[PDB]
């Protein structure tokens, strides 16, 4: 009972799954047997659907209509299909949602209308879709949000309105969609939003506002008390306000890069015990270290391009579980102990104004891997400063006006960088330093201390550079 | 060239797909071959960007089809599907399983 | 053995320019010299021989002696006529002893002496003209001693001198005309002192001076006394405490070749400061926070390397490279550059580093015709658009760093054969790329792993290729 | 350890010399060995710093002994010595060669 040139196979017994994709059809066949629970019509150059279509397939659970050139759909085209759980209509040429054709399909769960040329969503053309939980309106020509059409979708759980031309979100725009968990609005043109434009969705866990034209921080975020994952990167925001993310504990990932940020309130990242990573580059106006009360589960902290002059002496009380710390490009002179910040593996304090490295300044960091103190003004390093660092393998002390050098500890790293220390004239031996494979020395004669047409063989052992 | 593919090379398969197709990269060990589908096969989710449409592997625990990262769409039969994420128990808020497992 | 001196016991000896005999009586743990030292000695090395007195019975009468060594011998003073008999002495060595002052007379009148070593002692006082009658002295070593002032008067009797070092001492001031008579002087070393102050005319004497070492000292301001040294070739005042280089600082010193002022807490440099030095090779300036505009380099076109970082330069003149041909290295990292000039005139450029700036666009002519260019770094910038033919005429290009930027695309025209490519940080850069277009690539960093993958990464004599997500 | 050497290692020879000795680095092909002399052998000049006293090879063409880099002190016999650097000609400013070749 399966059409010609199509491939077909049984379902959960009896019912028959049909694949009539890219055969370059003109119209469907009526040769379609009933008992069809799956119909794939795709890329088959279909214009009309049709003068003589076929509902009467009360077993159809999933129909695909991708790649077929349509513009509109007959109001009773899907009437006979009561068991339709998933409909696919992407990559066509609809200039508006079918004015009726789609209302009342109580079994429909997943509806795809992406990659069309739609610019208008008729008020409640989705009426009576009480089982719809997935809506795709990607790559379309929308200009505003279908607030009214959405009002009839309290069933929705996942929606995308990405790659459109939406430029504003009015208050309660998604107001009745309280079952919604995932909202994607990326790659639009949103320049303005209301104080209460996300007030509806109580269940929302992730929110994508990326690649848009926002000029200010979305304060409408505050009502999203169960938000877990937030993105508004690649916008035009200029600052993050004090207590910005107070309304959203249990947040896990926040994403605001490619944003011309200048200042961030030190309170902004308070009370997010679920946050893992924080990154902040080029924040020129930041003068002090952020308060991280109620957020101890940070694994990574990077804050660069600012004017931080000093760190609290108890900075590492809120930073256990921290694994990388990057405070490059700041104005630090005096450093704290960092010992309490165990589980630390990478430290980057380059381009700062540190002048001294004491005994306790990096002691008891058994997991430390990479330490960079390059481009600083470090004149004195206590000889036993690196004594208790078993895991240390990479060390950058370039450009630092050093005159001597500690051999206690670090007795087997692998990357060593000392160029720029002119007073560093001292000599060193290869023993002390097994596992060294990359070195850079202020003077060549020091490099020499490490050894530095037919066949030939490279036998690469070790490097050095004057 | 190939089917729905606007740029190929035997070394890498398809590199650029048709204006509205997804590129699927298959890891046949040490190699990567690209194809051009209109939907992504079970295990992957459809992702549309202005520059590139990729099928993306759905690293969601015990799941079959999914809407995106961190949101599953038809969790594994034998486990419950509650609002995107799938777990064995599930609310107890206003749900619990009935006939089919759709909390 | 047709002719064999005539040399003391346990010492080694060998002939000179015929007959005259060179003697090595160094480290024998001697106590005093022996007699029977034959004449015809043109070289006598007594060193590390633990001698106290020189002597109850010394030995002049060695009128053929050309060079005496007395290093490592524990001395305190020298008899006034110890060197009288030595008429042909051209070099005397007295370093590594314990003189607490220069022999008040003992060195006076030695008309043949050319080289005098008095370093590594504990001398702190130079008796007024203990150098009297030394019209052939051209090399003076007073290193590692305890001087506190310049022996002005004693130096006044040294118009013959050509090279002098007063390094590793405690001199903290140089008064005007301190070296006033040393007009034959070519090389002056004053490094590792404590010079905190010097006069406007402390170097007015030496007309012939070619190099000047003021390193590792305590200068708080720029030595303007330099102004009269019109024959200066090489200047060092690094590791001081200078905070700025004034406008027209090195005006008085054309034919300067190398200048050294690193390890100086510099803040500002006058834009004229480096004018009219056609012979300069390198210029380097880091952490000059207060510099807002590009230095003027009129009459200085022979720069081979130029680096100016850590400043507030907002923009470059459209004509920067008219003063900068022959440039090979350009490092203008850590500034506020947004708009870039053409660089075309800056040929022979081999490496360029413009990282951490605020550049937003790289136009067509921004790197045209740079045939010697190898490495280009534009990392940590805000480059969104790159003109498709921007890299079209760069035959030697092999390293390119575009990390941390705002790219979405990339020019494949030109550059179809580098070796280092760095694109991580470009998030919109989601496009795929092929192995063809890019042979010779061995090091890559990609915004997304699946892109790295297109190059295999998850004879063969070159090695394996790299890539990183 | 060794002679006049306050820190040694068989692999590299001496690493730090006595308070007032010079370290001479000998390039015995792909390897480097340091010794401690009180004067640097012909071809090298004595260099004094607070941290380290180095013997420095005198990279001046056609020269024998030298005061430092860029200033020669006893030029190659057969060549003339005018103000540090050596020439075949030489000034003609107020010099020229006389009896011995030391461009007055
Ligand atoms: C591609 O689609 C077009 C519709 O635009 C199809 O055109 C019809 O073709 C039939 C013959 O198959 C004609 O009788 C109709 O008059 C055509 N209608 C229109 C509106 O053009 C076409 O057949 C399809 N071609 C392929 C190769 O699939
Ligand atoms: C928006 O959500 C739905 C409409 O989709 C409304 O829920 C109805 O609530 C009544 C009782 O309160 C139930 O009997 C209906 O079955 C529900 N309908 C659906 C489709 O779930 C809800 O009232 C609306 N909320 C507001 C504030 O208008
Ligand atoms: C140093 O003493 C020696 C003594 O040996 C003198 O050398 C010769 O000594 C032999 C006997 O050993 C005599 O036959 C020779 O006549 C001596 N030669 C001369 C030239 O006198 C040597 O002269 C003494 N030199 C000095 C400077 O006192
Ligand atoms: C000089 O050296 C000898 C051994 O060479 C030693 O016995 C003597 O004590 C030293 N002189 C002094 C002042 O100790
Ligand atoms: C330098 O000192 C000598 C003393 O020997 C004197 O004759 C000469 O005139 C002095 N030169 C100058 C320029 O004063």
PDB file of N, CA and C in Angstrom, chain A residues 42-43 64 66 85 88 90-91 109 112 114-115 117 133-136 138-139 157-160 163 178-182 184 186-187 203 205-206 211 228-229, chain B residues 3 18-22 37-40 42 45-51 53 66-74 81-85 87 100-103:
ATOM      1  N   UNK A  42       9.486  15.886   1.369  1.00  0.00           N
ATOM      2  CA  UNK A  42      10.503  16.918   1.527  1.00  0.00           C
ATOM      3  C   UNK A  42      11.330  17.187   0.270  1.00  0.00           C
ATOM      4  N   UNK A  43      11.592  18.471   0.016  1.00  0.00           N
ATOM      5  CA  UNK A  43      12.377  18.942  -1.131  1.00  0.00           C
ATOM      6  C   UNK A  43      11.749  18.579  -2.478  1.00  0.00           C
ATOM      7  N   UNK A  64       5.888  15.690   7.438  1.00  0.00           N
ATOM      8  CA  UNK A  64       6.954  16.600   7.060  1.00  0.00           C
ATOM      9  C   UNK A  64       6.658  17.203   5.697  1.00  0.00           C
ATOM     10  N   UNK A  66       8.895  19.977   4.541  1.00  0.00           N
ATOM     11  CA  UNK A  66      10.038  20.851   4.308  1.00  0.00           C
ATOM     12  C   UNK A  66      10.403  20.950   2.829  1.00  0.00           C
ATOM     13  N   UNK A  85       1.079  14.573  15.916  1.00  0.00           N
ATOM     14  CA  UNK A  85       1.852  14.999  17.074  1.00  0.00           C
ATOM     15  C   UNK A  85       2.985  15.941  16.673  1.00  0.00           C
ATOM     16  N   UNK A  88       5.876  19.586  10.265  1.00  0.00           N
ATOM     17  CA  UNK A  88       7.088  20.218   9.767  1.00  0.00           C
ATOM     18  C   UNK A  88       6.813  20.950   8.461  1.00  0.00           C
ATOM     19  N   UNK A  90       8.992  23.865   7.562  1.00  0.00           N
ATOM     20  CA  UNK A  90      10.095  24.803   7.385  1.00  0.00           C
ATOM     21  C   UNK A  90      10.637  24.820   5.960  1.00  0.00           C
ATOM     22  N   UNK A  91      11.301  25.924   5.621  1.00  0.00           N
ATOM     23  CA  UNK A  91      11.965  26.127   4.332  1.00  0.00           C
ATOM     24  C   UNK A  91      10.986  26.207   3.163  1.00  0.00           C
ATOM     25  N   UNK A 109       2.224  18.581  19.037  1.00  0.00           N
ATOM     26  CA  UNK A 109       3.180  18.833  20.111  1.00  0.00           C
ATOM     27  C   UNK A 109       4.351  19.683  19.627  1.00  0.00           C
ATOM     28  N   UNK A 112       6.914  23.298  13.312  1.00  0.00           N
ATOM     29  CA  UNK A 112       8.007  24.027  12.684  1.00  0.00           C
ATOM     30  C   UNK A 112       7.557  24.962  11.558  1.00  0.00           C
ATOM     31  N   UNK A 114       9.950  27.599  10.600  1.00  0.00           N
ATOM     32  CA  UNK A 114      11.153  28.399  10.430  1.00  0.00           C
ATOM     33  C   UNK A 114      11.599  28.436   8.972  1.00  0.00           C
ATOM     34  N   UNK A 115      12.520  29.346   8.669  1.00  0.00           N
ATOM     35  CA  UNK A 115      13.084  29.506   7.329  1.00  0.00           C
ATOM     36  C   UNK A 115      12.029  29.779   6.263  1.00  0.00           C
ATOM     37  N   UNK A 117       9.245  33.197   4.764  1.00  0.00           N
ATOM     38  CA  UNK A 117       9.263  34.643   4.597  1.00  0.00           C
ATOM     39  C   UNK A 117       8.053  35.268   5.274  1.00  0.00           C
ATOM     40  N   UNK A 133       4.043  22.238  22.496  1.00  0.00           N
ATOM     41  CA  UNK A 133       5.091  22.613  23.441  1.00  0.00           C
ATOM     42  C   UNK A 133       6.389  23.063  22.761  1.00  0.00           C
ATOM     43  N   UNK A 134       6.418  23.063  21.432  1.00  0.00           N
ATOM     44  CA  UNK A 134       7.628  23.419  20.705  1.00  0.00           C
ATOM     45  C   UNK A 134       7.309  24.237  19.462  1.00  0.00           C
ATOM     46  N   UNK A 135       7.704  25.507  19.456  1.00  0.00           N
ATOM     47  CA  UNK A 135       7.434  26.349  18.291  1.00  0.00           C
ATOM     48  C   UNK A 135       8.689  26.952  17.647  1.00  0.00           C
ATOM     49  N   UNK A 136       8.827  26.704  16.345  1.00  0.00           N
ATOM     50  CA  UNK A 136       9.957  27.247  15.594  1.00  0.00           C
ATOM     51  C   UNK A 136       9.532  28.355  14.635  1.00  0.00           C
ATOM     52  N   UNK A 138      12.087  30.546  13.371  1.00  0.00           N
ATOM     53  CA  UNK A 138      13.425  31.024  13.042  1.00  0.00           C
ATOM     54  C   UNK A 138      13.462  31.595  11.630  1.00  0.00           C
ATOM     55  N   UNK A 139      14.479  32.410  11.358  1.00  0.00           N
ATOM     56  CA  UNK A 139      14.766  32.939  10.024  1.00  0.00           C
ATOM     57  C   UNK A 139      13.517  33.456   9.312  1.00  0.00           C
ATOM     58  N   UNK A 157       6.435  25.036  25.800  1.00  0.00           N
ATOM     59  CA  UNK A 157       7.554  24.777  26.698  1.00  0.00           C
ATOM     60  C   UNK A 157       8.867  25.293  26.111  1.00  0.00           C
ATOM     61  N   UNK A 158       8.914  25.412  24.788  1.00  0.00           N
ATOM     62  CA  UNK A 158      10.128  25.823  24.093  1.00  0.00           C
ATOM     63  C   UNK A 158       9.803  26.656  22.857  1.00  0.00           C
ATOM     64  N   UNK A 159      10.371  27.856  22.767  1.00  0.00           N
ATOM     65  CA  UNK A 159      10.083  28.683  21.597  1.00  0.00           C
ATOM     66  C   UNK A 159      11.294  29.454  21.076  1.00  0.00           C
ATOM     67  N   UNK A 160      11.380  29.545  19.751  1.00  0.00           N
ATOM     68  CA  UNK A 160      12.444  30.344  19.161  1.00  0.00           C
ATOM     69  C   UNK A 160      11.900  31.369  18.180  1.00  0.00           C
ATOM     70  N   UNK A 163      16.668  35.126  14.487  1.00  0.00           N
ATOM     71  CA  UNK A 163      16.865  35.635  13.133  1.00  0.00           C
ATOM     72  C   UNK A 163      15.603  36.256  12.562  1.00  0.00           C
ATOM     73  N   UNK A 178       3.229  30.507  30.658  1.00  0.00           N
ATOM     74  CA  UNK A 178       3.820  30.231  31.959  1.00  0.00           C
ATOM     75  C   UNK A 178       4.472  28.853  32.029  1.00  0.00           C
ATOM     76  N   UNK A 179       4.228  28.022  31.021  1.00  0.00           N
ATOM     77  CA  UNK A 179       4.853  26.705  30.972  1.00  0.00           C
ATOM     78  C   UNK A 179       6.155  26.771  30.190  1.00  0.00           C
ATOM     79  N   UNK A 180       6.413  27.937  29.608  1.00  0.00           N
ATOM     80  CA  UNK A 180       7.584  28.142  28.770  1.00  0.00           C
ATOM     81  C   UNK A 180       8.850  28.001  29.599  1.00  0.00           C
ATOM     82  N   UNK A 181       9.790  27.203  29.105  1.00  0.00           N
ATOM     83  CA  UNK A 181      11.031  26.940  29.819  1.00  0.00           C
ATOM     84  C   UNK A 181      12.201  27.600  29.094  1.00  0.00           C
ATOM     85  N   UNK A 182      12.099  27.676  27.774  1.00  0.00           N
ATOM     86  CA  UNK A 182      13.205  28.134  26.952  1.00  0.00           C
ATOM     87  C   UNK A 182      12.777  29.195  25.947  1.00  0.00           C
ATOM     88  N   UNK A 184      14.225  31.796  23.029  1.00  0.00           N
ATOM     89  CA  UNK A 184      15.358  32.231  22.215  1.00  0.00           C
ATOM     90  C   UNK A 184      14.992  33.416  21.318  1.00  0.00           C
ATOM     91  N   UNK A 186      17.652  35.480  19.920  1.00  0.00           N
ATOM     92  CA  UNK A 186      18.938  35.961  19.428  1.00  0.00           C
ATOM     93  C   UNK A 186      18.901  36.383  17.960  1.00  0.00           C
ATOM     94  N   UNK A 187      19.883  37.194  17.575  1.00  0.00           N
ATOM     95  CA  UNK A 187      20.015  37.705  16.212  1.00  0.00           C
ATOM     96  C   UNK A 187      18.799  38.487  15.716  1.00  0.00           C
ATOM     97  N   UNK A 203       8.054  29.746  34.624  1.00  0.00           N
ATOM     98  CA  UNK A 203       8.843  28.518  34.541  1.00  0.00           C
ATOM     99  C   UNK A 203      10.152  28.661  33.770  1.00  0.00           C
ATOM    100  N   UNK A 205      13.660  28.920  32.247  1.00  0.00           N
ATOM    101  CA  UNK A 205      14.970  28.560  32.788  1.00  0.00           C
ATOM    102  C   UNK A 205      16.124  29.130  31.960  1.00  0.00           C
ATOM    103  N   UNK A 206      15.923  29.283  30.654  1.00  0.00           N
ATOM    104  CA  UNK A 206      16.953  29.890  29.813  1.00  0.00           C
ATOM    105  C   UNK A 206      16.409  30.973  28.882  1.00  0.00           C
ATOM    106  N   UNK A 211      23.299  38.801  20.120  1.00  0.00           N
ATOM    107  CA  UNK A 211      23.379  39.342  18.765  1.00  0.00           C
ATOM    108  C   UNK A 211      22.272  40.345  18.454  1.00  0.00           C
ATOM    109  N   UNK A 228      18.117  29.928  34.852  1.00  0.00           N
ATOM    110  CA  UNK A 228      19.329  29.139  35.060  1.00  0.00           C
ATOM    111  C   UNK A 228      20.444  29.550  34.108  1.00  0.00           C
ATOM    112  N   UNK A 229      20.068  30.035  32.933  1.00  0.00           N
ATOM    113  CA  UNK A 229      21.056  30.309  31.907  1.00  0.00           C
ATOM    114  C   UNK A 229      20.650  31.543  31.102  1.00  0.00           C
TER     115      UNK A 229
ATOM    116  N   UNK B   3      24.486  16.826  -3.142  1.00  0.00           N
ATOM    117  CA  UNK B   3      23.079  17.156  -2.933  1.00  0.00           C
ATOM    118  C   UNK B   3      22.915  18.233  -1.870  1.00  0.00           C
ATOM    119  N   UNK B  18      23.225  24.458   1.139  1.00  0.00           N
ATOM    120  CA  UNK B  18      22.244  25.349   0.526  1.00  0.00           C
ATOM    121  C   UNK B  18      21.767  26.402   1.529  1.00  0.00           C
ATOM    122  N   UNK B  19      21.217  27.526   1.030  1.00  0.00           N
ATOM    123  CA  UNK B  19      20.847  28.674   1.870  1.00  0.00           C
ATOM    124  C   UNK B  19      20.074  28.345   3.144  1.00  0.00           C
ATOM    125  N   UNK B  20      19.287  27.277   3.123  1.00  0.00           N
ATOM    126  CA  UNK B  20      18.459  26.939   4.278  1.00  0.00           C
ATOM    127  C   UNK B  20      18.556  25.478   4.681  1.00  0.00           C
ATOM    128  N   UNK B  21      19.734  24.899   4.493  1.00  0.00           N
ATOM    129  CA  UNK B  21      20.006  23.557   4.982  1.00  0.00           C
ATOM    130  C   UNK B  21      21.047  23.535   6.097  1.00  0.00           C
ATOM    131  N   UNK B  22      20.996  22.467   6.881  1.00  0.00           N
ATOM    132  CA  UNK B  22      21.890  22.252   8.006  1.00  0.00           C
ATOM    133  C   UNK B  22      23.081  21.394   7.585  1.00  0.00           C
ATOM    134  N   UNK B  37      21.411  18.358   5.364  1.00  0.00           N
ATOM    135  CA  UNK B  37      20.040  17.903   5.588  1.00  0.00           C
ATOM    136  C   UNK B  37      19.085  19.061   5.846  1.00  0.00           C
ATOM    137  N   UNK B  38      17.771  18.800   5.803  1.00  0.00           N
ATOM    138  CA  UNK B  38      16.862  19.878   6.202  1.00  0.00           C
ATOM    139  C   UNK B  38      16.442  19.740   7.663  1.00  0.00           C
ATOM    140  N   UNK B  39      16.617  18.542   8.205  1.00  0.00           N
ATOM    141  CA  UNK B  39      16.480  18.299   9.635  1.00  0.00           C
ATOM    142  C   UNK B  39      17.605  17.385  10.119  1.00  0.00           C
ATOM    143  N   UNK B  40      17.914  17.460  11.409  1.00  0.00           N
ATOM    144  CA  UNK B  40      19.030  16.703  11.961  1.00  0.00           C
ATOM    145  C   UNK B  40      18.547  15.368  12.502  1.00  0.00           C
ATOM    146  N   UNK B  42      18.084  11.784  14.583  1.00  0.00           N
ATOM    147  CA  UNK B  42      17.961  11.541  16.026  1.00  0.00           C
ATOM    148  C   UNK B  42      19.299  11.647  16.758  1.00  0.00           C
ATOM    149  N   UNK B  45      20.185  18.380  17.261  1.00  0.00           N
ATOM    150  CA  UNK B  45      19.148  19.401  17.172  1.00  0.00           C
ATOM    151  C   UNK B  45      19.500  20.468  16.140  1.00  0.00           C
ATOM    152  N   UNK B  46      18.453  21.021  15.530  1.00  0.00           N
ATOM    153  CA  UNK B  46      18.576  22.032  14.490  1.00  0.00           C
ATOM    154  C   UNK B  46      18.945  23.380  15.082  1.00  0.00           C
ATOM    155  N   UNK B  47      20.004  23.978  14.550  1.00  0.00           N
ATOM    156  CA  UNK B  47      20.458  25.283  15.005  1.00  0.00           C
ATOM    157  C   UNK B  47      20.652  26.218  13.820  1.00  0.00           C
ATOM    158  N   UNK B  48      19.947  27.343  13.831  1.00  0.00           N
ATOM    159  CA  UNK B  48      20.018  28.270  12.713  1.00  0.00           C
ATOM    160  C   UNK B  48      20.720  29.559  13.115  1.00  0.00           C
ATOM    161  N   UNK B  49      21.755  29.905  12.362  1.00  0.00           N
ATOM    162  CA  UNK B  49      22.443  31.177  12.520  1.00  0.00           C
ATOM    163  C   UNK B  49      22.522  31.868  11.167  1.00  0.00           C
ATOM    164  N   UNK B  50      22.758  33.190  11.154  1.00  0.00           N
ATOM    165  CA  UNK B  50      22.884  33.862   9.857  1.00  0.00           C
ATOM    166  C   UNK B  50      24.053  33.350   9.026  1.00  0.00           C
ATOM    167  N   UNK B  51      25.166  33.016   9.666  1.00  0.00           N
ATOM    168  CA  UNK B  51      26.339  32.556   8.934  1.00  0.00           C
ATOM    169  C   UNK B  51      26.287  31.063   8.610  1.00  0.00           C
ATOM    170  N   UNK B  53      24.271  27.056   9.436  1.00  0.00           N
ATOM    171  CA  UNK B  53      23.295  26.150  10.030  1.00  0.00           C
ATOM    172  C   UNK B  53      23.920  24.786  10.337  1.00  0.00           C
ATOM    173  N   UNK B  66      15.912  16.266  20.988  1.00  0.00           N
ATOM    174  CA  UNK B  66      15.973  17.430  21.860  1.00  0.00           C
ATOM    175  C   UNK B  66      15.787  18.729  21.085  1.00  0.00           C
ATOM    176  N   UNK B  67      15.337  19.758  21.796  1.00  0.00           N
ATOM    177  CA  UNK B  67      15.033  21.051  21.195  1.00  0.00           C
ATOM    178  C   UNK B  67      16.310  21.852  21.035  1.00  0.00           C
ATOM    179  N   UNK B  68      17.206  21.680  21.998  1.00  0.00           N
ATOM    180  CA  UNK B  68      18.489  22.370  22.020  1.00  0.00           C
ATOM    181  C   UNK B  68      19.353  21.756  23.112  1.00  0.00           C
ATOM    182  N   UNK B  69      20.481  22.391  23.396  1.00  0.00           N
ATOM    183  CA  UNK B  69      21.214  22.098  24.613  1.00  0.00           C
ATOM    184  C   UNK B  69      20.281  22.268  25.813  1.00  0.00           C
ATOM    185  N   UNK B  70      20.488  21.455  26.846  1.00  0.00           N
ATOM    186  CA  UNK B  70      19.783  21.548  28.136  1.00  0.00           C
ATOM    187  C   UNK B  70      18.245  21.458  28.077  1.00  0.00           C
ATOM    188  N   UNK B  71      17.687  21.206  26.896  1.00  0.00           N
ATOM    189  CA  UNK B  71      16.247  20.960  26.779  1.00  0.00           C
ATOM    190  C   UNK B  71      15.969  19.733  25.903  1.00  0.00           C
ATOM    191  N   UNK B  72      15.563  18.632  26.531  1.00  0.00           N
ATOM    192  CA  UNK B  72      15.216  17.406  25.805  1.00  0.00           C
ATOM    193  C   UNK B  72      13.764  17.437  25.332  1.00  0.00           C
ATOM    194  N   UNK B  73      13.438  16.616  24.340  1.00  0.00           N
ATOM    195  CA  UNK B  73      12.134  16.723  23.698  1.00  0.00           C
ATOM    196  C   UNK B  73      11.389  15.390  23.728  1.00  0.00           C
ATOM    197  N   UNK B  74      12.133  14.292  23.670  1.00  0.00           N
ATOM    198  CA  UNK B  74      11.549  12.973  23.849  1.00  0.00           C
ATOM    199  C   UNK B  74      12.549  12.128  24.620  1.00  0.00           C
ATOM    200  N   UNK B  81       9.892  12.557  31.595  1.00  0.00           N
ATOM    201  CA  UNK B  81      10.250  13.806  30.941  1.00  0.00           C
ATOM    202  C   UNK B  81       9.480  14.953  31.589  1.00  0.00           C
ATOM    203  N   UNK B  82      10.145  15.705  32.459  1.00  0.00           N
ATOM    204  CA  UNK B  82       9.528  16.876  33.070  1.00  0.00           C
ATOM    205  C   UNK B  82      10.170  18.201  32.662  1.00  0.00           C
ATOM    206  N   UNK B  83       9.420  19.008  31.913  1.00  0.00           N
ATOM    207  CA  UNK B  83       9.855  20.337  31.467  1.00  0.00           C
ATOM    208  C   UNK B  83      11.309  20.388  30.996  1.00  0.00           C
ATOM    209  N   UNK B  84      11.585  19.799  29.836  1.00  0.00           N
ATOM    210  CA  UNK B  84      12.914  19.862  29.257  1.00  0.00           C
ATOM    211  C   UNK B  84      13.864  18.787  29.754  1.00  0.00           C
ATOM    212  N   UNK B  85      14.064  18.746  31.066  1.00  0.00           N
ATOM    213  CA  UNK B  85      15.020  17.832  31.678  1.00  0.00           C
ATOM    214  C   UNK B  85      14.316  16.539  32.072  1.00  0.00           C
ATOM    215  N   UNK B  87      14.049  12.990  34.391  1.00  0.00           N
ATOM    216  CA  UNK B  87      14.460  12.363  35.651  1.00  0.00           C
ATOM    217  C   UNK B  87      13.546  11.152  35.917  1.00  0.00           C
ATOM    218  N   UNK B 100       1.257   7.282  28.824  1.00  0.00           N
ATOM    219  CA  UNK B 100       2.586   7.502  28.266  1.00  0.00           C
ATOM    220  C   UNK B 100       3.378   8.403  29.208  1.00  0.00           C
ATOM    221  N   UNK B 101       4.701   8.353  29.106  1.00  0.00           N
ATOM    222  CA  UNK B 101       5.571   9.034  30.058  1.00  0.00           C
ATOM    223  C   UNK B 101       5.803  10.488  29.674  1.00  0.00           C
ATOM    224  N   UNK B 102       4.825  11.348  29.944  1.00  0.00           N
ATOM    225  CA  UNK B 102       4.951  12.744  29.545  1.00  0.00           C
ATOM    226  C   UNK B 102       4.595  13.706  30.676  1.00  0.00           C
ATOM    227  N   UNK B 103       5.028  13.358  31.892  1.00  0.00           N
ATOM    228  CA  UNK B 103       4.764  14.087  33.148  1.00  0.00           C
ATOM    229  C   UNK B 103       3.766  15.238  33.067  1.00  0.00           C
TER     230      UNK B 103
END
